[PDB]
């Protein structure tokens, strides 16, 4: 699937539960994995609008080359059946 070899840290606790679950199944059904914790194996971190990252988390992200993206990155990649340009979905741009 389009998310093969992607490991997403999910920080989307302010989304409705149905959307959180749909994010998870969209990721799993398309070859990806997710965790709720940020670690060096994460390739991506998905961040809803209301969630924030500490300086520690930002330092880890930079160190491990983690891509910061909003939920639209997942939604739109699924909709277009193609992994999109994650750089177009960076809230911390």
Author numbering: 4 to 96
Wording from the paper:
We identified PARP4 lysine residues K23, K24, K31, and K36 as potentially important due to their vicinity to lysine residues important for PARP1 BRCT binding to DNA. A double mutant to glutamine was created for the two neighboring lysine residues (K23/24Q), thus removing both charges and potentially limiting any redundancy or compensation at this location that might have occurred with single mutants. The K23/24Q double mutant of BRCT showed very little to no evidence of binding. Our mutagenesis results led to PARP4 BRCT variants that exhibited a range of deficiencies in binding to vtRNA, with the K23/24Q double mutant resulting in complete loss of BRCT binding to vtRNA. The double mutant K23/24Q led to the most notable increase in thermal stability. We noted an additional water molecule adjacent to residue 23 when it was mutated to glutamine in the K23/24Q structure. This local increase in hydrogen bonding potential conceivably contributed to the increase in thermal stability of this BRCT variant, as an increase in surface hydrogen bonding is a common explanation for enhanced thermostability. We analyzed the mutant with the strongest phenotype, K23/24Q, in the context of the BRCT-WGR-CAT fragment of PARP4. The K23/24Q mutation was also effective at considerably reducing vtRNA interaction in the BRCT-WGR-CAT fragment, and the deficiency was comparable to that of a complete BRCT deletion. The BRCT mutant K23/24Q should serve as a valuable tool to investigate the nucleic acid–binding cellular functions of PARP4.
